[PDB]
Design an enzyme around this catalytic site. Structure first.
Site, short mmCIF file in Angstrom:
data_model
loop_
_atom_site.label_atom_id
_atom_site.label_comp_id
_atom_site.label_asym_id
_atom_site.label_seq_id
_atom_site.Cartn_x
_atom_site.Cartn_y
_atom_site.Cartn_z
CG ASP A 222 -4.25 -8.62 -3.73
OD1 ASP A 222 -4.42 -8.75 -2.51
OD2 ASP A 222 -3.35 -7.99 -4.23
CD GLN B 35 -12.77 2.80 -2.20
OE1 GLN B 35 -13.25 1.70 -2.47
NE2 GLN B 35 -11.45 2.99 -2.15
CG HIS C 163 -1.18 -12.39 -1.68
ND1 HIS C 163 -2.00 -12.81 -0.68
CD2 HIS C 163 -1.53 -11.12 -1.96
CE1 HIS C 163 -2.83 -11.82 -0.36
NE2 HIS C 163 -2.52 -10.75 -1.08
CG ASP C 164 -0.06 -8.89 0.59
OD1 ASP C 164 0.72 -8.39 -0.25
OD2 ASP C 164 -1.29 -8.71 0.60
CG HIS D 210 -1.40 -5.14 2.96
ND1 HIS D 210 -1.54 -3.78 2.82
CD2 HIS D 210 -1.73 -5.69 1.76
CE1 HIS D 210 -1.92 -3.51 1.59
NE2 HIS D 210 -2.04 -4.68 0.92
CG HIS E 79 -5.19 -9.14 2.56
ND1 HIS E 79 -6.22 -8.90 1.68
CD2 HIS E 79 -4.06 -9.10 1.84
CE1 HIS E 79 -5.72 -8.73 0.46
NE2 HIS E 79 -4.40 -8.87 0.53
#
Ligand SMILES: CCc1nc2ccccc2nc1N1CCN(S(=O)(=O)c2ccc(C)cc2)CC1
Ligand SMILES: [Mg+2]
Ligand SMILES: [Zn+2]
Length: 314
Positions: free
Chosen positions: A218, A270, A107-108, A69, A73
């Site tokens: 995202d 996953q 956004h982060d 993050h 990213h």
């Protein structure tokens, strides 16, 4: 400016238009990649270069040196939005094109590499200030903080009205990156699409569709070529495992996804994620915006690579 067109080397100029573009390991090129995308997505006129560059550089400074993050990213998520916007030219407003690349870059903001759950269980002050979408309300707050720094109001030409609209696009776009909100949003979008009630003139519907774009951008590591997807997974799990260790320090068994003693379970985890989250996400997004189909295709390719990992074929 304003006859000052940003340009990339030939390989990047061409590959930046594709959904599966990787921005590469040269951190000092990422600002120029972003400005390039804004200029082509929005216009050379949408922002003052000096203000935009000062904005980008303060946003960068407010991302932390965490395994996943981080600043890379931020710019990767913004690139996925650029590819969606560029493939759906006529569907988006002037304010949407302005807000959405900025929302993606921010956004982060100030992420610490920990989930909303961990903050809540730690009893972080942010969990008392923001009872739901805890980190996402923080990211939006940090975005407004940076916009309010001297010389950083990239929105300065907008009227009072347009400025409130753009900051409301960004707020909703950032809040929608709370995956806890994604499941309901996609269910509603799927019902609306299938009963043919979906209406891009209903602002409440545009809001939903921008939310789903935000999830899709995202999650876009699942839409890369396998060697990128596979290496990005390592960074994702390095954060999860640190959080697991921190859960263990509070005297809480973490879920297996965050337990580094349960590394053998990653491939099956996953699978669940592609099946429960990723494939549905890109499937619904492709129904609403047909030109995003290469994201679904790449996601399905990567599900098949994880199946091979399990079958010991790799
Ligand atoms: C399979 C794991 C996974 N793989 C990914 C692979 C590629 C890209 C994105 C990926 N995202 C992933 N996460 C994102 C985080 N969520 S969450 O629901 O917000 C969550 C948060 C805290 C806790 C304690 C439980 C759940 C889970 C899924
Ligand atoms: Mg986030
Ligand atoms: Zn993110």
């Amino acid at each position: 400016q304003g006859l000052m067109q940003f340009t990339l080397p030939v390989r990047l100029c061409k590959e930046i238009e594709l959904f599966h573009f990787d921005i590469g390991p040269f951190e000092n090129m990422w600002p120029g990649i972003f400005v390039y995308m804004v200029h082509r997505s929005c216009g050379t006129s949408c922002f003052e270069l000096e203000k935009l560059c000062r904005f980008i550089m303060s946003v960068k400074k407010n991302y932390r040196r965490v395994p996943y993050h981080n600043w890379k990213h931020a710019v990767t998520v913004a690139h996925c939005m650029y590819a969606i916007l560029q493939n759906n030219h006529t569907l988006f407003t002037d304010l949407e094109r302005k807000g959405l690349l900025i929302a993606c870059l921010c956004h982060d903001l100030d992420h610490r590499g920990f989930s909303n759950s961990y903050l809540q269980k730690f009893d972080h002050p942010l969990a008392a200030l923001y009872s739901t979408s805890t980190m996402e309300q923080h990211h939006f707050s940090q975005t407004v903080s940076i916009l309010q720094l001297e010389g950083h109001n990239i929105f300065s030409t907008l009227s009072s009205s347009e400025y409130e609209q753009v900051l409301e696009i960004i707020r909703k776009a950032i809040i929608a990156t709370d995956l806890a909100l994604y499941f309901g949003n996609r269910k509603q979008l799927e019902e609306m699409y299938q009963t043919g009630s979906l209406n891009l003139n209903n602002q409440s519907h545009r809001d939903r569709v921008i939310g789903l774009m935000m999830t899709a951008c995202d999650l876009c590591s699942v839409t890369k070529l396998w060697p990128v997807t596979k290496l990005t997974a390592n960074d994702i799990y390095a954060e999860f495992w640190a959080e697991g260790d921190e859960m263990k320090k509070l005297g809480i068994q973490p879920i297996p996804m965050m337990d580094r003693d349960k590394k053998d379970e990653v491939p099956q985890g996953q699978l669940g994620f592609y099946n429960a989250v990723a494939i549905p996400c890109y499937t619904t997004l492709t129904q609403i915006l047909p030109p995003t189909e290469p994201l679904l295709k790449a996601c399905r390719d990567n599900l098949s690579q994880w199946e091979k990992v399990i079958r010991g074929e790799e």
